[PDB]
Design a protein around this ligand. Structure first.
Ligand SMILES: [Mg+2]
Ligand SMILES: [Mg+2]
Ligand SMILES: [Mg+2]
Length: 155
RNA sequence: UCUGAGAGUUUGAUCCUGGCUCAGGAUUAACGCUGGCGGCAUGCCUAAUACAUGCAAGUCGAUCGAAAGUAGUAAU
């Protein structure tokens, strides 16, 4: 049940020797709402073929996501170009306080409570890039234990 | 135990810098349309401009002389 939601449908065009070749570009986010989420951008002469190719690309590149108590473990800033997205842990109940492309990514990943603010640009591809970068740099409290030789997070 | 939502807009199309505008609240508010009632609260932001008229700090005869009024033949 990998649900998918369009996050942007732009109208790109090149110029030839007379006229304008117009192709639709779609940005689809696919997520199983259990820890797997990917993004795919595709271009085609028509929306249906563009959507099919974008979903195919998105399903080809699926990253693995870990959730802690339904939220994000530690506050993180994802950077991608000039877009910086701040994610902050939230108590169980606030809901997803995100909006736009980031909100779509968080819902499709599985996370519930999440504090976000877009501190940079409003271009959907870079915000999604920043969101995925922020979520992928996250450190579990068990990897640092193997690293720092602590006691499975114990004080 | 706190705790943050974005979008539109330069270009044939894209990214960035960057300004403008909008989605939310708020007031000692005014205007247009309309208009039934009740519980709370507010009500010259301007000319510290000029003001009719009527009210807004008096009280004690158990401090004191006198006066006045009513009863009383008078004293009282
Ligand atoms: Mg020619
Ligand atoms: Mg234009
Ligand atoms: Mg507004």
């Amino acid at each position: 049940e990998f649900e998918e939601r369009i996050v942007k449908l732009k109208r790109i065009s090149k110029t030839t020797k007379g006229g304008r070749n117009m192709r639709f570009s779609v940005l689809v986010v696919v997520g199983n709402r259990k820890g797997k989420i990917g993004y795919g951008i595709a271009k085609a002469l028509e929306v249906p073929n563009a959507i099919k190719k974008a979903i195919k690309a998105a399903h080809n590149s699926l990253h693995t996501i870990e959730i802690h108590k339904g939220s994000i473990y530690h506050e993180v800033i994802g950077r991608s170009g000039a877009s910086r997205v701040l994610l902050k842990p939230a108590p169980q109940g606030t809901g997803i306080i995100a909006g736009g492309a980031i909100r779509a990514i968080i819902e499709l990943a599985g996370y519930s409570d999440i504090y976000t603010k877009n501190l940079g640009r409003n271009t959907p591809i870079n915000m999604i890039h920043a969101t995925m970068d922020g979520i992928l740099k996250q450190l579990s409290p068990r990897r640092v234990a193997i690293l720092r030789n602590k006691n499975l997070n114990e004080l």
